[PDB]
Amino acid sequence: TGANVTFKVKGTDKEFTVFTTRPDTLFGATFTVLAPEHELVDAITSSEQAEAVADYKHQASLKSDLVRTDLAKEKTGVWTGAYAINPVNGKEMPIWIADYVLASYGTGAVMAVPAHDQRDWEFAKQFDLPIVEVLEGGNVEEAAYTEDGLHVNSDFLDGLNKEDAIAKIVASLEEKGCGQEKV
Ligand SMILES: Nc1ncnc2c1ncn2[C@@H]1O[C@@H](COP(=O)(O)O)[C@@H]2O[B@-]3(OCc4ccc([C@H](O)c5ccccc5)cc43)O[C@H]21
């Protein structure tokens, strides 16, 4: 039981969809990550970033799934040169490629929530990216908080728990056709 969320690419007519198990953390998504092998990558990569993106894709194709999803391995990646638009508030989120996202699982794209996902937190720490708390109970600057808590910094989701918030955001994204529940 997860959800699909669709993001527009700024300044283009392109879109991608991510698979998320925590659509309730949408207001804490500070960047997005595509698998280096994702089909959209070449289309949205800027000319300044083209060669670095090509180099990283080659490096990534030489690593197995197991090696890539290994928690202990240093996070790596490169900015595509593009930005995604958060449907709930129009906020820009830089689009990165990174090998800890796998092409074959879900859609091959994620929304990164460094405050509440360990791998995303490690990436943000490696690359000096913003970390935004959306569930209280932890100290997200020092460690990802992966448990239940009341929602904050999340507009209409404020004060709800995981169950209630997921139900509300999913129902709200469906209304707009920016997302739906998915198995
Ligand atoms: N292709 C992909 N490669 C790597 N990671 C991917 C991926 N596609 C989706 N993801 C990330 O993992 C899925 C779910 O994994 P699962 O099916 O094993 O439960 C995630 O949904 B996530 O979207 C935003 C989010 C916030 C917080 C978490 C966090 O780890 C969490 C998740 C559940 C309970 C408590 C904490 C996970 C995600 O990151 C995605």
mmCIF file of C-alpha atoms and ligand atoms in Angstrom:
data_model
loop_
_atom_site.group_PDB
_atom_site.id
_atom_site.type_symbol
_atom_site.label_atom_id
_atom_site.label_comp_id
_atom_site.label_asym_id
_atom_site.label_seq_id
_atom_site.Cartn_x
_atom_site.Cartn_y
_atom_site.Cartn_z
ATOM 1 C CA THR A 1 0.000 0.000 0.000
ATOM 2 C CA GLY A 2 1.814 3.063 -1.340
ATOM 3 C CA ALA A 3 1.034 5.973 -3.644
ATOM 4 C CA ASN A 4 2.030 7.537 -6.943
ATOM 5 C CA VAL A 5 2.715 11.277 -7.049
ATOM 6 C CA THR A 6 3.291 13.149 -10.324
ATOM 7 C CA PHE A 7 5.713 16.081 -10.597
ATOM 8 C CA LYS A 8 6.045 18.597 -13.462
ATOM 9 C CA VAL A 9 9.516 19.531 -14.694
ATOM 10 C CA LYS A 10 9.965 23.312 -14.505
ATOM 11 C CA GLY A 11 10.116 25.187 -17.820
ATOM 12 C CA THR A 12 9.099 22.163 -19.904
ATOM 13 C CA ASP A 13 6.063 20.041 -20.706
ATOM 14 C CA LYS A 14 7.553 16.901 -19.132
ATOM 15 C CA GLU A 15 6.410 14.999 -16.032
ATOM 16 C CA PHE A 16 7.527 12.079 -13.943
ATOM 17 C CA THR A 17 5.842 9.946 -11.330
ATOM 18 C CA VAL A 18 7.399 8.724 -8.103
ATOM 19 C CA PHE A 19 6.395 5.790 -5.942
ATOM 20 C CA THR A 20 6.107 6.681 -2.268
ATOM 21 C CA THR A 21 5.153 4.788 0.857
ATOM 22 C CA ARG A 22 4.805 8.100 2.738
ATOM 23 C CA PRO A 23 2.757 10.582 0.654
ATOM 24 C CA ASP A 24 2.082 12.350 3.994
ATOM 25 C CA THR A 25 5.665 13.703 4.001
ATOM 26 C CA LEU A 26 5.183 15.626 0.724
ATOM 27 C CA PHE A 27 5.743 19.065 2.364
ATOM 28 C CA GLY A 28 9.151 17.782 3.557
ATOM 29 C CA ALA A 29 10.302 16.674 0.081
ATOM 30 C CA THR A 30 13.274 19.006 -0.547
ATOM 31 C CA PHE A 31 14.604 17.383 -3.728
ATOM 32 C CA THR A 32 13.793 14.541 -6.181
ATOM 33 C CA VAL A 33 16.018 11.692 -7.397
ATOM 34 C CA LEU A 34 15.801 9.660 -10.609
ATOM 35 C CA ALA A 35 17.618 6.413 -11.284
ATOM 36 C CA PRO A 36 20.527 7.211 -13.626
ATOM 37 C CA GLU A 37 18.772 4.826 -16.099
ATOM 38 C CA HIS A 38 15.370 6.599 -15.886
ATOM 39 C CA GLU A 39 14.015 7.370 -19.394
ATOM 40 C CA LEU A 40 13.459 11.103 -18.733
ATOM 41 C CA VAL A 41 17.063 11.870 -17.722
ATOM 42 C CA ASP A 42 18.547 12.702 -21.157
ATOM 43 C CA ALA A 43 15.584 14.961 -22.082
ATOM 44 C CA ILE A 44 15.751 17.222 -18.986
ATOM 45 C CA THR A 45 19.523 17.338 -18.463
ATOM 46 C CA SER A 46 20.967 20.811 -19.171
ATOM 47 C CA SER A 47 23.873 21.295 -21.607
ATOM 48 C CA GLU A 48 26.144 22.396 -18.727
ATOM 49 C CA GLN A 49 25.390 19.159 -16.809
ATOM 50 C CA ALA A 50 25.356 16.797 -19.859
ATOM 51 C CA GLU A 51 28.933 15.426 -19.589
ATOM 52 C CA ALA A 52 28.830 14.947 -15.796
ATOM 53 C CA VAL A 53 25.462 13.144 -16.172
ATOM 54 C CA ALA A 54 26.958 10.883 -18.921
ATOM 55 C CA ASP A 55 29.984 10.062 -16.735
ATOM 56 C CA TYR A 56 27.807 9.194 -13.737
ATOM 57 C CA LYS A 57 25.452 6.983 -15.786
ATOM 58 C CA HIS A 58 28.479 4.959 -16.960
ATOM 59 C CA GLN A 59 29.792 4.619 -13.390
ATOM 60 C CA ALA A 60 26.324 3.541 -12.162
ATOM 61 C CA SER A 61 25.889 0.809 -14.819
ATOM 62 C CA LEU A 62 29.038 -0.849 -13.425
ATOM 63 C CA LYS A 63 27.464 -1.351 -9.959
ATOM 64 C CA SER A 64 25.044 -4.126 -9.017
ATOM 65 C CA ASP A 65 21.684 -3.547 -7.293
ATOM 66 C CA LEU A 66 23.055 -4.959 -4.015
ATOM 67 C CA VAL A 67 26.078 -2.619 -4.039
ATOM 68 C CA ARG A 68 23.825 0.355 -4.915
ATOM 69 C CA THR A 69 21.249 -0.156 -2.100
ATOM 70 C CA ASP A 70 23.929 -0.898 0.515
ATOM 71 C CA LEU A 71 23.362 1.536 3.445
ATOM 72 C CA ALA A 72 27.086 1.620 4.326
ATOM 73 C CA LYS A 73 28.281 2.928 0.911
ATOM 74 C CA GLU A 74 29.079 6.657 0.441
ATOM 75 C CA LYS A 75 26.271 8.493 -1.387
ATOM 76 C CA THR A 76 27.085 9.791 -4.883
ATOM 77 C CA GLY A 77 25.192 11.664 -7.594
ATOM 78 C CA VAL A 78 24.969 14.690 -9.903
ATOM 79 C CA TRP A 79 22.414 17.469 -10.502
ATOM 80 C CA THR A 80 20.593 17.126 -13.831
ATOM 81 C CA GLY A 81 20.281 20.915 -14.257
ATOM 82 C CA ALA A 82 16.472 20.706 -13.863
ATOM 83 C CA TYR A 83 13.766 21.275 -11.164
ATOM 84 C CA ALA A 84 10.556 19.489 -10.228
ATOM 85 C CA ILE A 85 7.389 21.261 -9.044
ATOM 86 C CA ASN A 86 5.728 20.136 -5.807
ATOM 87 C CA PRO A 87 1.965 19.890 -6.600
ATOM 88 C CA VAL A 88 0.781 21.049 -3.137
ATOM 89 C CA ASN A 89 2.595 24.438 -3.107
ATOM 90 C CA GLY A 90 4.441 24.954 -6.423
ATOM 91 C CA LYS A 91 7.848 24.876 -4.693
ATOM 92 C CA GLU A 92 10.899 23.987 -6.810
ATOM 93 C CA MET A 93 12.905 20.864 -5.944
ATOM 94 C CA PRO A 94 16.206 20.223 -7.790
ATOM 95 C CA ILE A 95 16.247 16.958 -9.791
ATOM 96 C CA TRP A 96 19.280 14.766 -9.099
ATOM 97 C CA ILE A 97 20.379 11.391 -10.383
ATOM 98 C CA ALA A 98 21.901 9.013 -7.829
ATOM 99 C CA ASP A 99 22.661 5.289 -7.884
ATOM 100 C CA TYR A 100 20.858 4.508 -4.589
ATOM 101 C CA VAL A 101 17.676 4.819 -6.621
ATOM 102 C CA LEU A 102 17.095 1.666 -8.760
ATOM 103 C CA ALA A 103 15.600 1.750 -12.266
ATOM 104 C CA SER A 104 13.453 -1.380 -11.873
ATOM 105 C CA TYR A 105 11.675 -0.712 -8.556
ATOM 106 C CA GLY A 106 8.469 1.358 -8.405
ATOM 107 C CA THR A 107 8.765 4.018 -11.126
ATOM 108 C CA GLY A 108 12.551 4.394 -10.855
ATOM 109 C CA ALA A 109 12.017 7.887 -9.346
ATOM 110 C CA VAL A 110 11.612 9.148 -5.737
ATOM 111 C CA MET A 111 10.732 12.241 -3.759
ATOM 112 C CA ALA A 112 13.521 12.678 -1.219
ATOM 113 C CA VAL A 113 12.489 13.414 2.380
ATOM 114 C CA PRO A 114 15.820 13.672 4.251
ATOM 115 C CA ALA A 115 14.180 14.410 7.633
ATOM 116 C CA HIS A 116 12.411 11.034 7.634
ATOM 117 C CA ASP A 117 14.260 8.597 5.332
ATOM 118 C CA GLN A 118 17.737 7.376 6.180
ATOM 119 C CA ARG A 119 19.127 7.100 2.658
ATOM 120 C CA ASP A 120 17.722 10.538 1.704
ATOM 121 C CA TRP A 121 19.234 11.984 4.918
ATOM 122 C CA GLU A 122 22.673 10.591 4.040
ATOM 123 C CA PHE A 123 22.416 12.080 0.521
ATOM 124 C CA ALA A 124 21.349 15.501 1.843
ATOM 125 C CA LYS A 125 24.229 15.429 4.371
ATOM 126 C CA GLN A 126 26.702 14.510 1.634
ATOM 127 C CA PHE A 127 25.464 17.279 -0.689
ATOM 128 C CA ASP A 128 24.560 20.068 1.798
ATOM 129 C CA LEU A 129 20.826 19.869 0.916
ATOM 130 C CA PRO A 130 17.954 21.217 3.089
ATOM 131 C CA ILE A 131 16.344 18.999 5.738
ATOM 132 C CA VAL A 132 12.739 19.852 6.694
ATOM 133 C CA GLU A 133 10.917 18.226 9.623
ATOM 134 C CA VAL A 134 7.284 17.317 8.894
ATOM 135 C CA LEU A 135 6.648 14.829 11.728
ATOM 136 C CA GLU A 136 7.680 15.741 15.260
ATOM 137 C CA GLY A 137 9.389 13.425 17.746
ATOM 138 C CA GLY A 138 13.034 13.605 16.680
ATOM 139 C CA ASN A 139 15.998 15.857 16.001
ATOM 140 C CA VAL A 140 16.216 15.679 12.173
ATOM 141 C CA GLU A 141 19.440 17.697 11.888
ATOM 142 C CA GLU A 142 21.275 14.872 13.730
ATOM 143 C CA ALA A 143 19.389 11.750 12.580
ATOM 144 C CA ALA A 144 16.465 10.869 10.311
ATOM 145 C CA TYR A 145 13.240 10.381 12.283
ATOM 146 C CA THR A 146 11.489 7.328 10.857
ATOM 147 C CA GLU A 147 8.639 6.881 13.353
ATOM 148 C CA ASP A 148 5.094 8.197 13.852
ATOM 149 C CA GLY A 149 4.365 11.712 15.088
ATOM 150 C CA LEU A 150 2.030 14.677 14.668
ATOM 151 C CA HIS A 151 2.551 16.532 11.379
ATOM 152 C CA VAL A 152 4.109 20.007 11.250
ATOM 153 C CA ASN A 153 5.141 22.444 8.479
ATOM 154 C CA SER A 154 2.546 20.667 6.325
ATOM 155 C CA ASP A 155 -0.351 23.159 5.992
ATOM 156 C CA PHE A 156 -3.686 21.291 5.990
ATOM 157 C CA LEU A 157 -2.019 18.144 7.348
ATOM 158 C CA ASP A 158 -0.878 19.881 10.570
ATOM 159 C CA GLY A 159 -1.794 18.050 13.776
ATOM 160 C CA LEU A 160 -2.668 14.714 12.146
ATOM 161 C CA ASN A 161 -0.916 11.358 12.624
ATOM 162 C CA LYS A 162 0.460 9.042 9.901
ATOM 163 C CA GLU A 163 -2.807 7.172 9.174
ATOM 164 C CA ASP A 164 -4.967 10.320 9.121
ATOM 165 C CA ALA A 165 -2.467 12.399 7.104
ATOM 166 C CA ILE A 166 -1.875 9.712 4.443
ATOM 167 C CA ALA A 167 -5.639 9.294 3.988
ATOM 168 C CA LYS A 168 -6.111 13.066 3.612
ATOM 169 C CA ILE A 169 -3.201 13.820 1.242
ATOM 170 C CA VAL A 170 -3.964 10.778 -0.973
ATOM 171 C CA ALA A 171 -7.632 11.811 -1.206
ATOM 172 C CA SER A 172 -6.517 15.404 -1.951
ATOM 173 C CA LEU A 173 -4.030 14.432 -4.695
ATOM 174 C CA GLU A 174 -6.655 12.221 -6.379
ATOM 175 C CA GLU A 175 -9.034 15.211 -6.545
ATOM 176 C CA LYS A 176 -6.424 16.951 -8.684
ATOM 177 C CA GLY A 177 -5.048 13.906 -10.536
ATOM 178 C CA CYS A 178 -1.533 14.502 -9.214
ATOM 179 C CA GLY A 179 -1.609 11.145 -7.462
ATOM 180 C CA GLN A 180 -3.526 8.058 -6.351
ATOM 181 C CA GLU A 181 -3.011 5.038 -4.069
ATOM 182 C CA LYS A 182 -0.946 2.217 -5.598
ATOM 183 C CA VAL A 183 0.128 -1.389 -4.912
HETATM 184 N N1 LIG B 1 13.367 2.797 -7.408
HETATM 185 C C1 LIG B 1 13.613 3.079 -5.996
HETATM 186 N N2 LIG B 1 14.863 2.936 -5.540
HETATM 187 C C2 LIG B 1 15.128 3.150 -4.241
HETATM 188 N N3 LIG B 1 14.200 3.592 -3.393
HETATM 189 C C3 LIG B 1 12.925 3.735 -3.791
HETATM 190 C C4 LIG B 1 12.592 3.459 -5.120
HETATM 191 N N4 LIG B 1 11.271 3.716 -5.248
HETATM 192 C C5 LIG B 1 10.795 4.091 -4.059
HETATM 193 N N5 LIG B 1 11.815 4.187 -3.183
HETATM 194 C C6 LIG B 1 11.756 4.514 -1.727
HETATM 195 O O1 LIG B 1 11.411 3.424 -0.877
HETATM 196 C C7 LIG B 1 9.811 3.519 -0.959
HETATM 197 C C8 LIG B 1 9.240 2.529 -0.188
HETATM 198 O O2 LIG B 1 9.995 1.386 -0.030
HETATM 199 P P1 LIG B 1 9.322 0.031 0.311
HETATM 200 O O3 LIG B 1 8.462 -0.342 -0.848
HETATM 201 O O4 LIG B 1 10.441 -1.020 0.434
HETATM 202 O O5 LIG B 1 8.532 0.162 1.576
HETATM 203 C C9 LIG B 1 9.689 4.855 -0.509
HETATM 204 O O6 LIG B 1 8.718 5.839 -0.311
HETATM 205 B B1 LIG B 1 9.577 7.000 0.121
HETATM 206 O O7 LIG B 1 8.936 8.188 -0.392
HETATM 207 C C10 LIG B 1 9.146 9.263 0.563
HETATM 208 C C11 LIG B 1 9.517 8.604 1.908
HETATM 209 C C12 LIG B 1 9.642 9.174 3.175
HETATM 210 C C13 LIG B 1 10.051 8.402 4.248
HETATM 211 C C14 LIG B 1 10.338 7.059 4.059
HETATM 212 C C15 LIG B 1 10.799 6.270 5.263
HETATM 213 O O8 LIG B 1 11.843 5.366 4.987
HETATM 214 C C16 LIG B 1 9.736 5.478 5.991
HETATM 215 C C17 LIG B 1 8.845 4.660 5.296
HETATM 216 C C18 LIG B 1 7.884 3.934 5.985
HETATM 217 C C19 LIG B 1 7.800 4.013 7.364
HETATM 218 C C20 LIG B 1 8.686 4.824 8.062
HETATM 219 C C21 LIG B 1 9.653 5.556 7.375
HETATM 220 C C22 LIG B 1 10.228 6.498 2.779
HETATM 221 C C23 LIG B 1 9.868 7.308 1.670
HETATM 222 O O9 LIG B 1 10.967 6.650 -0.322
HETATM 223 C C24 LIG B 1 10.793 5.580 -1.206
#
